[PDB]
Every structure is written in C-alpha cells, then in structure tokens.
Design a protein around this ligand. Sequence first.
Ligand code: GTP
Ligand code: GTP
Ligand code: GDP
Ligand code: GDP
Ligand code: MG
Ligand code: MG
Lengths: 427, 436, 52, 49, 58, 426, 434
Amino acid sequence: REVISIHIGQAGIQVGNACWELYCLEHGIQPDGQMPDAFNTFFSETGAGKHVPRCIFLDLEPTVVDEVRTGTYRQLFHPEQLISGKEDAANNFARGHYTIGKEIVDLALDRIRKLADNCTGLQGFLVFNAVGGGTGSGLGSLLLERLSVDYGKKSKLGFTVYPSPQVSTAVVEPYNSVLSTHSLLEHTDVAVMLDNEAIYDICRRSLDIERPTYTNLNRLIAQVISSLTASLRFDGALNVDITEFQTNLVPYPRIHFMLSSYAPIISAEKAYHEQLSVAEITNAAFEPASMMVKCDPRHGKYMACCLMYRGDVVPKDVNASVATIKTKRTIQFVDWCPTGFKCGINYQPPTVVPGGDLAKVQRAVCMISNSTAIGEIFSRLDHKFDLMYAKRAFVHWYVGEGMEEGEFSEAREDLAALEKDFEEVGA
Amino acid sequence: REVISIHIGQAGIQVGNACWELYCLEHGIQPDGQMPSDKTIGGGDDAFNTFFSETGAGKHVPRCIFLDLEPTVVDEVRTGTYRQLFHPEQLISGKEDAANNFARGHYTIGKEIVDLALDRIRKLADNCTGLQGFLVFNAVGGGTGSGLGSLLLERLSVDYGKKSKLGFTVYPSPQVSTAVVEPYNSVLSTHSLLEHTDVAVMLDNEAIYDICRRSLDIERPTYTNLNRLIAQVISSLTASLRFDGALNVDITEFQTNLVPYPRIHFMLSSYAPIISAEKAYHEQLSVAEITNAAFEPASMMVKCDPRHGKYMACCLMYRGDVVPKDVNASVATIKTKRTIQFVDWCPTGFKCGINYQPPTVVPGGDLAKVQRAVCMISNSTAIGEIFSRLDHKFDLMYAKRAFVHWYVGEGMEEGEFSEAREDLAALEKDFEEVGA
Amino acid sequence: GRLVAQVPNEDPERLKRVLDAKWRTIGVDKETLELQAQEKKDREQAEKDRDE
Amino acid sequence: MLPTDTMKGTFAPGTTKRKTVNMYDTQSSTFQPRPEGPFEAEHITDQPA
Amino acid sequence: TTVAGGKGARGEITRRPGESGNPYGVSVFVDEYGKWGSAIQGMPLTETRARMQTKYFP
Amino acid sequence: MREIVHIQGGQCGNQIGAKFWEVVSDEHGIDPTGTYHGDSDLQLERINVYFNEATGGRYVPRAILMDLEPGTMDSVRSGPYGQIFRPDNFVFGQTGAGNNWAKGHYTEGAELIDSVLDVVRKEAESCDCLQGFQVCHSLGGGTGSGMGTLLISKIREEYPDRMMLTFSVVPSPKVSDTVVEPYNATLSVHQLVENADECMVLDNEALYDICFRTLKLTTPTFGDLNHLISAVMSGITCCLRFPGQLNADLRKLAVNLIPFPRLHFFMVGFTPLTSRGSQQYRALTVPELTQQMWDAKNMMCAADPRHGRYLTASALFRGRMSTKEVDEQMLNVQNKNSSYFVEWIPNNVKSSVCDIPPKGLKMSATFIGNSTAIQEMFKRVSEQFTAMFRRKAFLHWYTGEGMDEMEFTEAESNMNDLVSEYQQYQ
Amino acid sequence: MREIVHIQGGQCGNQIGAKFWEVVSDEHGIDPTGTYHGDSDLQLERINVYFNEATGGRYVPRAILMDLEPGTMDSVRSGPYGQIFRPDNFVFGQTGAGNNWAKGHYTEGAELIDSVLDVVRKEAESCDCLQGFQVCHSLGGGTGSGMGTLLISKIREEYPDRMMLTFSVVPSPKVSDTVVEPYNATLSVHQLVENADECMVLDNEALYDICFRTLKLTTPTFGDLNHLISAVMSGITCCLRFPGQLNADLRKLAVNLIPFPRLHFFMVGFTPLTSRGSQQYRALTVPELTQQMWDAKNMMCAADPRHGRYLTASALFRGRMSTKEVDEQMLNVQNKNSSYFVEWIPNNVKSSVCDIPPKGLKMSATFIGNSTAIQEMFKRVSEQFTAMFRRKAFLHWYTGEGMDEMEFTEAESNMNDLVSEYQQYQDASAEEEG
Ligand SMILES: Nc1nc2c(ncn2[C@@H]2O[C@H](COP(=O)(O)OP(=O)(O)OP(=O)(O)O)[C@@H](O)[C@H]2O)c(=O)[nH]1
Ligand SMILES: Nc1nc2c(ncn2[C@@H]2O[C@H](COP(=O)(O)OP(=O)(O)OP(=O)(O)O)[C@@H](O)[C@H]2O)c(=O)[nH]1
Ligand SMILES: Nc1nc2c(ncn2[C@@H]2O[C@H](COP(=O)(O)OP(=O)(O)O)[C@@H](O)[C@H]2O)c(=O)[nH]1
Ligand SMILES: Nc1nc2c(ncn2[C@@H]2O[C@H](COP(=O)(O)OP(=O)(O)O)[C@@H](O)[C@H]2O)c(=O)[nH]1
Ligand SMILES: [Mg+2]
Ligand SMILES: [Mg+2]
C-alpha cells in the first residue's frame, strides 16, 4: 500500500518539507532516522534501525535543495533523493521544458523506477508543484508526460497551485499556467486545486495570524494531505483507498479539478468556547469562507462530494449531518447526481506539531468536492492571459528557448474547449 | 427548548450586558464561564439549556450576538468582567458608526455587516434543536439600532419567516431626548417594523426614570438601573420557558392571545413590585396590591396613559408564592372595576401565567429579595396616541426640510419619506378604528 | 478497516471513549491548549524583544 | 452492567511485517517457562501438593 | 401534593446523551441515561468529570 | 373482562389522568413502584379492566398520554406514581398547539394522530373485550380541544359500536384563563354533539366554589380539583370493578339517561364532601348522602338545575347498604319537588348499588343527571362567541391555518340549534 | 446429515459473518479457541451442520471468507473467536475492487473466483448431504456485490438442485454511503432474480430505526446491526439444529413461501427487541411476541407492507410453547386484517416450532414476509438509476473495462419487468381464469 510523492520546484519541496516533518512526527520517527507497520506507505525499513522517505525532491536551482541538505533532517533523506540542477529555469516554461528540463529529466525518472521497484503494492503517484514558476510548470509537464507514458493508468494525484487572481508574485505566470494546464488536463488523474489568497484568508480569519508566512500555508497543506492519506496509513471504521476517489469523484475523464476544504481550522483559545462536534464542522466545510481556493460554489452545482473524517467519529452522526446538508437549499446538487456524497471515517485523530498554530482537535473533516466554479476560475485566468498575448509581450523569450507561437494558440483553444465542456456539463 | 437573543445597537449592547449578567447569576454561572467547583449536580439543574450551550469542558457560551458599528462598547465588553464568557466571534463590531442616520446604516454601512451577522446566526440556530423564536433589542433613536436593524429584520423574515421575532425597541421620549434627528429614525424604523416584528413592546426611558425616582427612591439613576429593570422583565417573561410552574405560558402564546389583528402588535409593559430594600420589610407584599400596582400609568415603562385608551388584551406573569385562587380573585376584582374599560371585543381579556421560581436579586442593584412579583404586558390604543404625538413633531420638522440633505446624500430620495409618512398615518387610522 | 487493521474491534480505550457520547460531542485537552497559548505569548514576546 | 465484563476471547495482532527471523536466533525473544515462578501461599513447593 | 404543569424543568424524557446539561458517563441505553437527577442526586460536578469512563448509572 | 381504555389530552387532561391513576392504583392496592401489595382477594379479581399483568405482580395502567409539549410528560414522570406508566404509551408531539383550535385540529393533529391511532389500536387489540373508551381533556386549549376532537373522530370512525365517556372541562366567564376560549369551545362542542356518546361537563368555577364552602380550604390548588374529578371518575366505573347487589355498566347508564341521541350532556356531583373539622360532628346515613347529592351548590358545573327541569338522572352507590332506603329516598326526592322533574318521563331516577366503598369511607355516591338547564352555559358561551366573531376579531389566527369563515357560522348555527332543542324539551 | 455452508463477501459480509459465527459459537457451546466446553448433549448432536470435528473436540466453522484487501481478513483474525476459522478458507486477493461492480465482476473476480470455486467445492464435497449454500454480502460495494453475484452464478451453474440463501443489504436514499450504489444494485438485482433461490432484503435504514425506536440505544454502531442480522440468520437455521414439535427446513420454507420462481424476495423481522429500562413494564406472553412480529416498525426493510398485500408469510418459533396459542394468534392476525392478504391464496401463513431458544431468552420468533410492497425499494433504486444513467454518468468506469450500455439497459429492463410482475400479482383479480 505504498505511495511515492514527487516534488517539483521550490514550492513543491517546501510543501514536502512541511509534509515530511508532519509524517516523521506522526509515526514517531526521529529526525536522525530511528524510532525510539503504518509507516510502510511513506518510509522503508532500510538496513537496521533506519527509515528513508519514498520521495524525490527535484529543482533546477541549488539554494533551497542544499538548504534542505544542511538542515536538521540530514540523515533522514538519502543523499541521492534531493535532485538539484545547476541553473534555474527563471520563470520560463519554454526554458524548463526544452532547454534545461531535458537534461535533468532522465536522472529523475531512473530514481522513480528504483522507488517503484521496492514498491510492491504501489497505490499511485501524487505530485506537488506550482504552475506559476518555470521548474514546477515546465519540467513538471514533461515529467508527467513521460511518467504517464511509462505507466499509463497509474493514479497521479495533482496538488497543484494556480496563480491567485488579484494578487501574484510574477508577470509571466499566465503563460506558464496555460502551457502547463494544457498537459495537466490530459495527463493528471485527479487534480486538487490550491490557491494562495484563500489560505491567506483562512489564516487571517480562523487562525487569527495577522502576519502569516509560507510555512503556515505549507503546514495546512500537509495537514490536508495527512488527513487524505490517513485511510491508507491508519485503520478506521470505513476507510477508502486511492481508487475510491477516482471511482466516485470523476464523472468524466476530462473533468478532474477538485476544490479543497478542511475543518476545523481553529486556534487554541477559540477552541475553548466553540462546541466542537461533527455536524457543525461538516457545515463549516461547505461555506466558501473556509475553502482553499477563492471560488464561490454558490455560482455552481456540485457533481460530487467527498468527506474524510478523523478522530472519535461514528457513522450515525455523519449520516445525520449528510441528511441535514441534503435537506438544505443554500447549496444545490446537479440533477443527474442524486447521491453526490461519499463518506469515510478513520480512527486516528490528527496530530499536532510543536510551533504549530492548530489546536489539539479530537475530530476533523477534510472535504474534496467537484463543482463548476473552477469553470469561472479558468475563464478568469484566460482573460488575463489573452490581455497579455494580444500585444505579443514576453513571447520572444519563449520563441528563443525553442518553441513557437503555435503552442500558445493551441493552448488557448484547449482552454476554450474546456470552458465549453464545463458550461455544457453544468446544465 | 432554546431561545437566542440578538442585541443590535449600543443601547442593545448595554441591555444585553445587564440581561446576561442577570442570567448568569440566576443559573449560578460564575462570570468566568464555568460554574463553581462546589456545585453539586442534582434536581433543578440543566435549566440553562435554553440560554447557554456547553462547550469543551466546563464552559457555557451564551446563545447571543452583540453587533454594533462603533467598536467602543464592544471593546469595553471585550475588556470588562465577562471576558471569558462570550465567544470572541459572537460580538460583531463594525469600524465606523452610522452617526444617528437611518440612511447610512441601512444602505451604505449595513450592507457589509448584515452578511456576517446572518452567517453567525445560521450556525447558532443550527446548534439549536428546539428554537422557540427570536427576540431583538434595539433603540430606534440611534442609527445602528434603527438603520441596519431594519435590514436584519428584513433578512430574518426572508430566511425563516414563521419563526417568532420579539421586538423590544426603545422609542424616544416625548418631551425629553438626547438627539435631534431621532424622528426620522423612528418613523423609518417603524415603517419596516410593522410587517416584520410579530410582537412589539414599547420601552421609554422617561417612564423608567419616573419608576426609579418614585418607587426605588433613587434620585440620581443612570442607564444601569434601567437596564437592570429591563433584564428583570425579560427574565420574568422567559422563566416559564426556563423553570417549572403550576401554569406556565410560552413565547408562542403571546401572539395568539394578545394580537387580534396582524398589523396591531404594540404592547405596553409594567412591573410590580418595584420596591427598595427598606420599603419591602415594612409593607406585606400580596398579589392583590402588586396586581393593582401594575395598572396605574405611574408604573408603566412607556410614557402613555391607558386611561385614555381601551384594553384590547392583557397578559399576566406571576413568579413566587402564587396560588391560582388569589390571582383569580384579583383578576375578578380588576374586571369588576370601572376605572378601566375593556374593549367590546374581548370580554375574557386576561391571560395569567404562574411560575414557581421567585425573581432573583443582583448585588449592586436596588430591588430586594421579594416573595412574589408580577410582569404586565397588555395592549391598548394609547400607542395610537404616542404614535400621533411623534407624528405631529416629525411633520413639524419635515415641513421645512431640516437635516434631509444628510439622508439625500447617503442615497435615499423623498419618496421613502412620503411612503413611511403614509404608512404611519394608516397605522394611526387603524388604531382609532379598532378602538371603535 | 478496508486496507489496514492495527487497533482491534474492541479496544478498551476506543470503546470507552466512543461509549461516552459526551466525549464524541465535545472533547478537549485543556493543558495542551494552555501550553499552546503560552507558546503563542512567548512568540510575540520574542518578536517584540527582537524589535527592541 | 457494562458489556465488556462478559467479553470473552483471545486476541491476535492485526497486520504486521513478515517475521523474517526464526526462533533459534539469540536476538529472537522467546518464552521461558522455567524457573517455576512466584508460588503463592506456603507448602506449595511440589506440583501434586 | 401539587404537580407542576406545562413545560420547563427538563425531566426524564427530554434528557439525552448529547445536550447542554447532561453529565459524562458510559451509557448503552437512552432511558437508563435519562435518569441521572434521580440516581446521582448530590455528587459534585468535579467528581463526574473525574469518573470519566465509568458506569455509575442505572 | 370488559375493558376500559384511558385517553388524556392537554395539560389539564394529563394532570387529571395522573391524579385519577393515583387514586385508582390506591384503590386496587398497587404500590408506586407498580407491584401489588393489597390484602383482600377482591382487589385482585377485577384489575384487568385498568391494568395489564407484566411480570411478578407488575401491573401497568391502560392509558394513553398525548399532547404537544415535553414538559407535561416530564412532570408526569417526575411526580409520584410516575414510574408505573409504560414509556411506549407516551405518544408525543414536539412543536405545540398553544390555545389554537385550528393548529391542533388541522396542522399539528394531522401528523400526530397517526401515532396516537397506532398506539390506541395496539392497546385495544391487546385486551380481548373492550367495554368503551374514556377521554379527559379541555375545550379551551389547543392540543386538548382540537387534537382531542380529531382523536374522537378517528376513534369513532375506527371503533363504531364501542362505548365512550368524555370528561371535558369547559371555561367559565368568572374564571377565564385564555382569550380564545369561545372560539375553541364552540367548535369542540360542535364536534362533541355529533360524535361523543355521552359527555360529563366540568368547570373550575364550580370546583373552586365546592372547595371554598364545603371542604373549607385556604389554598385549593389544582390538586384538590383533580382529586374531586378523579373521585367522580372512579365512582362512575365502580360497578365493573367490584361485585354489587345491582350492577350498572356504561351502556346501562347511557340507556337510562339519553332518550334522544343529541341530548348527552350531563351535570355531575360527588358525595359525601365534608371538611375534616366537621368530620366527627356528622352521621353516615343514606338520607345524609342524598340530601347533599341533590344540592345545587354541590354540582360541578355552572348550570343551576333549579332554572330548568331534571329530564333524567342517575345515582351510583358504593358500600354495603340497604336498597330499601335508596329506593325510598329516591322516591321521596322525586315526589317532593315534582316541579323540577319532567312530566312525560315517569321514574326519572336510575339507581345502582355496589358493596365496595372507596378507601377510608363506608358510604359514598355519584350523581350523573341529564338536565335541560345545561344549555344555559351553552348560551353564555355562544353570546361571547357572537360578540367577538361579529367583525372578525382574532380571525387571522384561524383563517391562516386553512380554515374558512364557514366553520364559525356552521358551529354557531348548530350550537344555536342545540340550545333551541334543549329549551324546547323544557 | 443436513449441511449448510456460510459464504461471506466484502467488508460488510465479513463483519456480519464474524458476528454470526460469534453468536453461533456461543449457541453451540464452543469456546473462542475452538474446543467444546458446554454442558448439555443437545449441543453435540447437530453441530455437523456448521462444524467439522478436527482433533480432541476441536470444531472448525464451515465457512469460506472473501475480500480483496487485507484489512478485512486481519480484522476478522484479530477479533474474538478469530482463532476458529481455518486459514485455508481465506480465499483472497490483495488489490481491491474499490466500489466498482465491473472491477469485482470482470477484471478482478475472473482470476480469484477460480480459487474460490476450488475452496467452496472442496468444502461442499467434504459433507454427506448438503442442504444448501448460504451467502451474505452487500449490493453497494464492489468485491461483495460483483464477485458475490459471480460466485452465486457459478455455484448455481454447478449445483442446480441445492438451496441458496442470500442475506443482501440494499442501498437506501436516506443513508447513501457511496455514489455508484444504483449502478451496483441494479445489476446485482438483475443477477439475483435469475440465480438466487430466495433473497432476504436488508438495509441500514430499518436497522437504525429499530435501534433508535425499539432498542432505544444511544449509539447504534454496526455491532448492533450485525447482531440483529446474525440473530435473524440463527432463527432461520434453528429448525435444523434442534428438535421441536414441528420441523421446517429451508426447502420447506421456500416451497411454502415462493408461489412463482421470480417472487423470491422476502422482508424479515425479529422479536422480541426491547430496551433494558423498559423490559420491566411489558408482559411476556406469546401474543406479545406475535403482535410485535407483525408490526411494520419491526421490519428490517425500508418498505411498509401496509402499502401492498401479503402474498405468503412464514414465522419461525424457538422455545417451548403451546401450538394452540401460536395457531390461534396466526388465525386472528390473518382474519382481522383481511385487506392486507392476497385473495387467491387462503392460509398464507406457515408456522413451525423449536424447543431451544437463543441465549438470554426463553421464547422468540422470526418472521418472513413475501410481500408485494417490496417492489417499492426496486422502484426507489431504479429512479436514481435512470436519473443517473440518462447522460452516461460515471459510465467510463464500466465501459472502460469491458462492459457496454446494453448491460445497463438489460438490468433496467429486468428490474422494471420484475416490479411490473409484482404489481400485477398485487392487484390480480381474485376469482377468474383465462
Ligand atoms: N502555496 C505556496 N506557493 C508557493 C510557495 N513558494 C512559491 N510558491 C508559488 O510558486 C510560484 C513561483 O514558483 P516558485 O515555487 O517560487 O519556484 P519555481 O516554481 O521552481 O520557479 P523558478 O523561480 O523559475 O525556479 C509563486 O508564484 C508562488 O505562488 C509556497 O511556499 N507555498
Ligand atoms: N433605555 C436605554 N436606552 C439607551 C441606552 N443607551 C442608549 N440608549 C438609546 O440609544 C439612543 C442613541 O443610540 P445609541 O445607543 O447611542 O447608539 P446607536 O443606536 O447604535 O446609534 P448611533 O450612535 O447613531 O450609531 C438614545 O436616544 C437612547 O435613547 C440605555 O442604556 N438604555
Ligand atoms: N381542573 C383543572 N383544570 C386545569 C388544569 N390544568 C389546566 N386547567 C384549565 O385548563 C385551561 C387551560 O387549558 P390548556 O392547558 O391551555 O389546554 P391545552 O392547551 O390543550 O393543554 C385553564 O382555564 C385551566 O383552568 C388542571 O390540572 N386541573
Ligand atoms: N449492516 C452492515 N453494513 C455494513 C457493514 N460494513 C459496511 N456496511 C455497508 O456497506 C456499504 C459499503 O459496502 P462495502 O464495504 O464497500 O462492500 P465491499 O466493497 O464488498 O467490501 C456501506 O453503505 C455500509 O453502510 C457492516 O458491518 N454491517
Ligand atoms: Mg523557483
Ligand atoms: Mg451608536
């Protein structure tokens, strides 16, 4: 029941830094690599009294990779895991896809094969990358293409990060987003959307942190991934595997873009006065103010909904809460899907980390849905891309790296076809 | 059984501050949130289910929200004695106030604060299971209470509708006041108050001042005593839901037995005995004299004279050592008295409610421990007199168009003033017609 | 469970904590909450100390 | 009368790794019945006693 | 003896495992748990918090 | 053997039934824990009518508790003899009617009557041979008047040939609790006249007067009135539960009190009723009981029989007595004030004797008299109804539930016809 | 002699089988470690129907377990009475269907059902007079519904004359766990209507309602529901294992309950089921057993028989009774409620008596109702199916593995003709022929 995670770019490996710290603290593995069988899906019993994470951290720039190498977890990671190039893609999809990407792609794929060889019950892959940059967008695209042609139907979960609409950190990022989504549409099995301003709002509102850094965002992402993979790791009353998500959450092969939500996100003090139970945190997992992508599901229809429960949770109260939600009319399900809910319960309560902001919570919910607000997200990105492409701005860089303007167009009509598909499905 | 109280406006916040202190003292909850360690579980507990929910371990959060546009009073609450009692997200606070302007708080500022209050109320009601009905506290003289209070009433009626909404407002006093533009606020709030509030009870400050000066012989009273008296009335009218009685009356009975017409819901209020710690010992308190004491205009909480009107309906609250025989005798003696006349329509014009728990006392207050008390809530046509009195002086200052430029600038027009004018005139005519 | 099974079907701790319905409805770890609160207070103390 | 009072049965560990080690290894933990152990009461020296 | 009528003072029927006044304790049957004001009748609340997972009920 | 099923509606119905079951359980000698601890074998031979043997001397009452609020059931289980009722028999609404005939007759009764009907059907088929049904409720409240009348309709349409008693408390103008008393009372009476087999009229004004003059009590709470009502209810059914020299069941009393099917409204009285201070200064003789039984001030209704004619009457006696004095006293009281009895019905008085008196007594009686003065209260209520309805006062709280103005007009017309025929037979 | 084999499929089937084997092991007096330590000789005479004697009073259950993921088998082993099951009877794969009927019916079932057939055939030939097969599984999951139905088809193809019971839980709308429940359920029913000898429809709606209303339990977990199902199965099998005044084997019930071969869907209930705080108030007599037996709220399907007619009925009785009282209660219930019984069959009710009650009781009852109101569930599932199937929803998970739309159309058509046949037999004219 092993799963290997690939981290592409700076953001991917920072998310991995949070995730692996959480994993090591959760299974009792010390940073040196020794415990003082649930660990089998992330760690491997190597030699005697040693565990090595099943992960490859790949980036084209050394700064962050050897910062990870020099940190506390020197011994935990095998030295051959942390792949590092010599020069950066420099926010250039074409550069990281044709120029520097080709050189480092072969080494990563051979390492992936060795991890897969040990993996006897490999459930699937799950990726981390940010499409705004060059390495996470350019090299990630080629890596997914060759990983798919190597395996074909193996599950590759996408925990990607699209640029946020109003706030962003670059100028050339719409081009990278479009040229990466053209392949993320057809090569990713399940994609989980993750926006930055939404997590900023979540931290400002719920965790009342007025000055949040990327560390809190990565910690929340790690909490989501842990609550998602606890069914693989720890036993519950009613667990679900990776194939469950594809089977019960993907109505059509071209529609895999999942909104993420988690509850309860609470501080230590506000945990004193809120009656923390199962029903109201399920209610809090459906409001747009507690979603990880700034989109309004009120504008769309739910094709399906998934629910992950952890802690002291029984089927009775989750069934009651699902019935209560189905009786509500604030959110509406699509007509062709009359049973758009799927529940899952795990015994293991969520863990806490020293220095973290989340309180010790005895029951938590991780929500993964599928609505059509992603449709307006795509069009909102497309309008900004088309504004830039009308004057042929920054195109000369990509043309110089080796690609031509035909890719830009074909990606534009690919997005247009996707918009039409999402509009037709919601009817 | 649950009831959640929303307090809108600075006056609403102070009234809620008195009410929740009285509630915590009445159920034995310490100001820090948890009941004392020496408490022993037994019969009589769990009564706080309709006001406090149990969270975490040993913590009771009130089923309430304070909402205001100016943060001074909310911050004083957040810093005062009951710091740990209220959930921080419950006390909604704005960034700028409406500044005695119905238009500003109804169209400019209230639009961005109404959504948060409704979002909190939705989850508060979802926590509840046997919600009886809402009740709102506000002062129509001010801006936040009147301006966006109408918006909250609008959206509460839209969201639920059939659930009860008790509107215990604070109208400006006829001769004494604190502001200038309060007639516009009162008229524009009343226009939206007719078709949304199921039952309304008038609260005037001058009447409570007279009650305190005359009966409680406090010659320098502040708002604290007025709020304490309002809280005592609220507790006396919610104790039937809370504690067991020989014959108890619910919040749903008020509409059935006091509202003869859908547009006529304006209830006068009285309370007795309002006695200090010195007069209480000397005079023997019995139901006859306290019932007779809830009938003179000098013991009413709104500056009006029911002698000029006709008692359409009456409701009687009893707490303490009350047996039905003597209350039946008292109501018979009232019915046979001719200094007050009942309307032709309601020959059985009384509804009595008896509860066992006597009213509680609060340290720092003025009333002493009493064996029995009566809370009076009746309906008459003197409300048609106070509304006409407010009519005359609203028209008087609207004739020359004073302060109107403020409302025009906020985004209103002159049409809404006229439609509120006509609605108030129609309500006046209905009040004089029903009494015929 | 569907994939893994570590805790048995009648764990005394699990059965005790699930049978007490109050714990399922509400449950806290007050000491740890106080520890987190003091950790937060120490972090703003250290931040303003660096500024000083 | 909690139902756990009448709960009878012998329990076994759930899923685990393959043993990969035999009992003949010195590092392999084994159950040694002897020495006899803490007998209770007096004159319980010999077994038919 | 006079019997108080109407509603208020939640009794042996309204009381449920999950509400805002009921104590801790392991209960298998609702009606057995529905009578704690008659069974306990005088223990301090701190003791009920102390005896966390224990029967101490009819 | 012959079985009686108890039905309670509303707050007043629940309290009256609680006191009634207390006194009945006392009569048959079962303890508040539900176990038999009597002495004589006579107490054990006729307990099937009101109790079902569960296990080891455990007997549960044959009653249904039904209303729309938790607190009444909580109080029923809080008081003494609250642990003898079977929890399954507490059929139970959740929202409340609250002094609204329409709410308890069309909206709230609709989804609750199915469970009440299921429970009463289960409990009726539990025993072999039903004798009749028994109902205690109010004509002024919401969940007692409307829901009770709808239950009456359903159970009459379900079990047509069985008997039925109705002990209904009617509001009095002197003691008025709610505002909507006439609106509920008129429609409840409209249903009752066309569906109920026979009705016993009760009101709190008469009971307060009785506890004032006769019992001489300072604080006559609802406990004393409920005690009087429970004593009357036990007295009516005494012959079925114990042997006697001349027995009389429900049907035997009904046939001797109802010459016309629409005249089934009786005014009731109980005897003896004397204060404890004056308890030793009196003798226990049949004339001393029949002088108080026929007294107008001893009756439990606000309708003076001296303003009308005793159309029929019935008396049920308890205790080892002489039938000679019973017959002589009835004949003498019939002959003396011959102006108060109707002309075309000779021998207006029906009598029955049981030899088992209630606990603490050796001589007791119960009066059920069909008089034509019972329409005085109907006129007194109809005049208030006409005064209020005449320009649609409080109407919106009834029309908005689906009701129409015709329900008021038809109810008024039928009540007027009832009082007209009652005055005609005078 | 008479032999019954138990087959468990999927997670739900495995848990139900665990509870059933626990209660049966308790009933027959064997300890959790597998040896006999009972008291009476009645516990030895008829244990061959469920156990094989190995060595020194060791009796191994005659069961075959099934799944596709190790968690269920490990949970079965680790629980109490987990050391009685033979490790060779754990025919098993380790990939997982994943809530997919097609995966458990064509891709994964095709290679594992051969090992299942080996195990079950070695078992079925390990006995002298096989009475019938007994299968418990789900219709919402993938490894229990699809692979279970394929095993049912294969067994019916190999052994045609033997009996076959199916305790199958069906999805219901008030509690819907997964999304593809109608797709699995429709095709599973399409298979059962042609392969299964008789079916007993279960669902968690009625189990939860029974626990909430009748038992009044605070927290009705799956343990209580599995216990109820296990008690139902034990009361079904009781006649074979213990002497009585009137015996009724599974074949006798099938021939007394099935008037036409496609009408083999039964609704079941158990009696008595009362709260511990309320067991003091109630009388304990045979009429109390029968009255709660016939109650609609005691039934274990979300289908009220009041909405239809009783075609036939059966009641299973345990404990020493008088046949007079049973017969008169049946006659009374059959004659009073005259409109709820079909007319072209007089004496719709079959009865039998056993002398041994279940643990903790002295008398009990089990009711089987072949009603025409069961097609309410089939319509209630078919509406969701035809709403979802209208625009090919989730279809690529089935057509992308070998299936075509024609299978879905055939399943829908078969379900529709089944409900139409039930409806016509409900309102069939009483006294005519053509
Ligand atoms: N959520 C989240 N997003 C991040 C984080 N770090 C970087 N990003 C996103 O990544 C985008 C730019 O890519 P980077 O991750 O900084 O680096 P890169 O993808 O390797 O691209 P290069 O700079 O060319 O190497 C920014 O627009 C951010 O939105 C992070 O820690 N958390
Ligand atoms: N009875 C009573 N009335 C009060 C109290 N405090 C304020 N008021 C009334 O409130 C009115 C003015 O409104 P404020 O309470 O000051 O504040 P507001 O209602 O939010 O209106 P703005 O100040 O314009 O935002 C005055 O005319 C008073 O009559 C109080 O403690 N008791
Ligand atoms: N005798 C008697 N009368 C009662 C009792 N409880 C209430 N009442 C009378 O019933 C009337 C109110 O009925 P109500 O409780 O509203 O009926 P409900 O709404 O159907 O429950 C009042 O006039 C009371 O005088 C009681 O216990 N005994
Ligand atoms: N009665 C009962 N139902 C169960 C149990 N376990 C699971 N279920 C139900 O079965 C459905 C899921 O079936 P699943 O376990 O996936 O079947 P499988 O894939 O064949 O193992 C859910 O709707 C549950 O409600 C159980 O132990 N008892
Ligand atoms: Mg970078
Ligand atoms: Mg203000």
